[PDB]
Amino acid sequence: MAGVKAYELRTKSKEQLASQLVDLKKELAELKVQKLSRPSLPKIKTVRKSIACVLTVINEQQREAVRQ
Amino acid sequence: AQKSFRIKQKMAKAKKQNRPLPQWIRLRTNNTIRYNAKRRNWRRTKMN
Amino acid sequence: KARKAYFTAPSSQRRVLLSAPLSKELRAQYGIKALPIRRDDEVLVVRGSKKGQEGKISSVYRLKFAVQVDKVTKEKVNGASVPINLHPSKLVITKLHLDKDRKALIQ
Amino acid sequence: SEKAGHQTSAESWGTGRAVARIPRVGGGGTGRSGQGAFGNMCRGGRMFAPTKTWRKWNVKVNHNEKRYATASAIAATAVASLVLARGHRVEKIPEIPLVVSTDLESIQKTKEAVAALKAVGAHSDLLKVLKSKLRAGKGKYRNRRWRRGPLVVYAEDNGIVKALRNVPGVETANVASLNLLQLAPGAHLGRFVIWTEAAFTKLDQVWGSETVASSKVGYT
Amino acid sequence: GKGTPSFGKRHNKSHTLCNRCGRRSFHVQKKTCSSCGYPAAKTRSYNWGAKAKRRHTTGTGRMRYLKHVSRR
RNA sequence: UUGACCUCAAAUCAGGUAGGAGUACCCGCUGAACUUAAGCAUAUCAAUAAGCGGAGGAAAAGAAACCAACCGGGAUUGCCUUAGUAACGGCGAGUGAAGCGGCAAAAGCUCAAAUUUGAAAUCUGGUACCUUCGGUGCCCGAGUUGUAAUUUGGAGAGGG
RNA sequence: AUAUUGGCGAGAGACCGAUAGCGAACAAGUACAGUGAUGGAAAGAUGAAAAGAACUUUGAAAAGAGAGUGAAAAAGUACGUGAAAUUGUUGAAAGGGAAGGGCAUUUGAUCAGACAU
RNA sequence: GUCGAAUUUGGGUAUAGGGGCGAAAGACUAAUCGAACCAUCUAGUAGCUGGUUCCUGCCGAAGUUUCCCUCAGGAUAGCAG
RNA sequence: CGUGGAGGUCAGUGACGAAGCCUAGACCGUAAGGUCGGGUCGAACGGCCUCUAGUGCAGAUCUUGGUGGUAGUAGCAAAUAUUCAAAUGAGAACUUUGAAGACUGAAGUGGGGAAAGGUUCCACGUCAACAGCAGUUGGACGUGGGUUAGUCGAUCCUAAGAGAUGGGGAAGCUCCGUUUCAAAGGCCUGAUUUUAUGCAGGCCACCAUCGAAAGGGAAUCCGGUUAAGAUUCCGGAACCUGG
RNA sequence: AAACUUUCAACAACGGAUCUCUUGGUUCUCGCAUCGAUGAAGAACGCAGCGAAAUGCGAUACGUAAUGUGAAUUGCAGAAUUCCGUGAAUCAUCGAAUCUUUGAACGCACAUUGCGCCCCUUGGUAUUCCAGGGGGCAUGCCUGUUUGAGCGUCAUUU
To answer: Which GO terms describe its cellular component (chain A)?
Structure first.
């Protein structure tokens, strides 16, 4: 997630890890709507790499799944 | 010349990297080498 | 020969090359040859011209191969201050910012 | 490198342009390789010879000879009007050769050895090994950055008195070995033998499968 | 005539790049050439030092010391 | 009117399969000239370069339809020899390999042809030490079925 | 079965040392040339360390002159070393269509020895 | 010179190397043509040209003999060290 | 005599300065060469005995790099073609503005395009370079902006032509064939139908597809707008296509 | 007499040789057995707060995960806001992932980002028309499965 990882690793629904993801996303987007001078970004980078942490942690706990 | 993306995108890139040396890199604590060194001049070398 | 695995290796073994000797006191009490120069530590620049001069090794620019000592800094005749890159294994570990990890390591 | 700069697809130009009948290449961009390559006289062309693996790299000498050889200069290790001038620095007791108690075939310690090999009177020389000025020619740049005269060589029988390893200059052997290099390296006649057990007393032990001989009477 | 005066007529082509490689090389009218002759491409080579080297995408067969030798 | 036997297909209907790549070096096919002959055809160059189609960790070869005198020897492979010699040749220029000897590495073996027509094989399902499409089982179900076992250098006997 | 060699890995060399060495020590199979296949380079080094130089001179400005940094700017990102062709300046000398040798000497310039105590 | 017809010309297409195409010149075929261009064979060959790198000291020449598809080479004598 | 390198030994030389470089300065060789001094720089290097080879240059119309005499020379000469004055600038023959004078005088030096070009377009900033004198100016350098569709075009169609598959030649890359060789190719309305899918019947090698920004070819125009677009954006007024 | 001209001095100056430098090359030797339809080699086009390229990477884009190292900073200390005792960008990592548009290239094509067909699920709300997300349709052969073909041909209660 934004951690951790050791965190996102558990355990809310696909419809829970959901608005976590959708959340971080509306983040990244607004985080862009900033776009104004500097720009650091810095936590655009943060929010991003995290966006993925979510994404990846999300595509495994549906895999070990298929693995049953 | 009403182009086609194939040659569009490319046209666009000519632009995107048609730019003078970055200047940060100039002081990367290592070396860096000066001058764009790859420098199309839409009047010297030419596209496709 | 090689000497490039040297002048071109990864931090994961650039610290352990950027190493440093321990204080007589330390090299007696704690009882270890030396170690992997650590940050919040303190030291006393042994044989370099900024000799005997002392203080804390704020940061260590490994990707510059050399560690820096807080107070000991290079002075601009131009109303400005700039650090004086110091070469680790030519100083002397006054006191170590001992941490459970660095601790354990003492073996 | 076989592909030795006959790596261009270049030509001559048919006499008719002032230039000379050497291969040339290109065009265009720039100057070269529109120049003139594939040739010795030019730049980055074949060596003359152009060398090769195939050469006579190794050489062959005969036994009975490398024997009158190794021999010729076992017997240099005595008469040390030479073994003075051939390197090693001696006073060394009125005893050439100059043997050591068959103890040293053990001496599992360096100093106990070194130092021993020293009260054995070798100091004077075990030091010369220590005017070590560092090379010259570009040798350096290629893993050979040393230049230290030769030293003291102790003859074994049982082990390598390998305490004497890191010993700076002195070199150990055995009995039925010794390169006709070592036994007078500097490939000149004369080297120091701090000897040993059945060593001096049981060098020969000749044969082998034959050997030895010589003839000029009273060497006077 | 044969030269200058002509010459300045170049205005058709031998190119349109490719889809593989693409160093300008599909005989527009002929179709496919100068390297990956779409189709069967097979690089289409010979014996004369090319390169034709480049970067993969494999070398991750530094596995080996870890194939089923560290895959399981 | 209703089953098969048989050649032939059609299925996105099930599941695998190949196809490209590629320095070296291995199996093939296919094939120059330049060159030397002080000419030039013969020929040499050369079973060489180029072209093409196939592998591998090597490949290929290998248990003789061999070498051999008597003497005898005993699958290949490699090396040292054999040997610049037997031969081949405008017998010119040039080609030019073998086989009891010393090494290196060592291995030997299975089919077809013979009977009791198969109780031997694919799967796919249920379950199984093996945790989902999967190492192998068992039972069972469709399918295969001139392809279950002794016997093959030497014979083991093959049968009694 | 040293039965065969340049992709992985690692040892090493009387090998080259930047017009040598693979063409490529370097954003090199690059810049760049050719419709095309192909063809294809030049190019390393301030220092130990940027410590890369904050009045005044026009500044169009670029710089200069002093300044300051350093062990040195006879190290100024035109940066170790900096030969030669070749050019400037200072200094001397010689010249009636020409270049410059060779033997002897005059003159000027300059140098060593011999010092004899 | 010709200037509405064997006209002029864009685009698209077709013919590629002893092969194309040619109201024929040996023309043209990417400035290339009495056989294109690129790479390779390939450092092709060379009885002919050119150059062939540091000192002094010694000795010191041939052009003529004979056989060659030798006539600028080579063998063979003879001269030399 | 001299060179790169290897064995040796001289306990050789040296940051108090090793190489290399610079000297009508000194001395040794008959000479290859050698040795000092002095200036100079910066980390290495030599004598002797031997070993080794990519070991010595003036040439080869030699290689590559660099220079000069030629020489501030040749040269910078295609349309009558240019002028006053401001202004802006450190500086105007050349920049902008004004005025004057003259051209191209609709088969244009004007108003769009093709093909090719890629941002040269527009704004802003500013002159090392480039422009062949100059530069304040530019297409130049720096940072930013601007390409808006049911009706324009491409998309579909067929042209020469190119081309897979039914197959056939070739050791083979591949060659050859779309007009003379199962199952056809599918689709269709009705159909065995409560939404699969036979069937009633029909057309049936359709012998794949690619190939036109000038051919073929559904449907828009007027006005307004910008630093730079526009038959689109936006205003109004439309017509086509599919449902 | 100068200018000029030559000549040799020193100083600059053109030029970049000589000297020493070496994260290259070159040749040696010794281990080792691996590409792809489970989509390779190769190509585009993109991805940093700031980036042109070399480099790494793929819309999870100089990187996600996971390990141990780590124990302390990375793109190491360019700046920069930067963030840290719950483990930071480094190594290893390939007992995980993501892997655009492609290429043996793949439903048809492909100088275009062009053109179809299924199945699932959303809007218009009648499945049959138009738009959204998900899954899918190459070929040659292997083997079984499953339907139908001939006057190849067997036998059946007619």
So the answer is: cytosol; cytosolic large ribosomal subunit; preribosome, large subunit precursor
Give the CA radius of gyration of chain D: 28
Map residue C39 onto helix, strand or coil: coil
Q: What does the DSSP 8-state code read for residue E6?
A: T
Chain B residues close to C61, C-beta within 8 Å: 29
C-alpha of D129 from chain center: 16
Domain ranges of chain A: 2-68
Whole-angstrom CA distances from D92 to C82, D123, D183, D213, E1 are 63, 10, 19, 30, 100
List of chain B residues whose C-beta atoms are within 8 Å of the C-beta of residue E24: 48
Q: Which amino acid is at D54?
A: W
Taking only residues 1 to 30 of chain E, the set having a beta carbon closer than 8 angstroms to any beta carbon of chain B reads 15, 17, 24
User: Nearest nt to A64, CA vs C1'?
Assistant: F132
Strands D171-172 and D153-154: parallel
| Degrees, nearest 5: CA angle D80-D81-D87 | 70
Please count the structural domains in chain C: 1
3-state secondary structure chain A: CCCCCCCCCCCCCCCCHHHHHHHHHHHHHHHHHHCCCCCCCCHHHHHHHHHHHHHHHHCCCCHHHHCC
In chain D, which residue ranges form alpha helices assigned H by DSSP? 63-72, 82-85, 110-117, 123-128, 197-200
CATH number for C34: 2.30.30.30
Cα D189 to Cα D16: distance, rounded to the nearest angstrom:
66
Amino acid present at D193: V
Please state at what angle helix A43-58 crosses helix A17-34, rounded to 10 degrees: 160
Q: Are C30 and C23 in contact (CB under 8 A)?
A: no
Name the β-bridge partners of C42. Answer: C56, C95
Is the link from the previous residue into D97 a cis peptide, with omega within 30 of 0? yes
Helix, strand, or coil (residue D185): coil
Give the separation between CA A18 and CA A22, rounded to whole angstroms: 6
Q: Are D8 and D38 in contact (CB under 8 A)?
A: yes
Identify which of C26, C31, C67 has the alpha carbon closest to the alpha carbon of residue C48. C67
D208: left (phi over 0), alpha (psi -120 to 50) or beta: left
Range of the domain at C93: 1-107
Chain G bases near protein Cβ (<7 Å): 8-9, 11-13, 15-17, 19-24, 26-27, 29-42, 49-54, 68-69
Q: By three-state DSSP, how is residue B10 classified? A: helix
- Segment (H or E) for D172: strand D171-172
What is the distance between the alpha carbons of residues D145 and C19, in angstroms, rounded to a whole number?
A: 27
How far are the Cα atoms of D74, D79, D151, D189 from residue D217, in angstroms, in the given order? 20, 17, 33, 21
| Distance separating alpha carbons of residues A27 and A25, to the nearest angstrom | 5
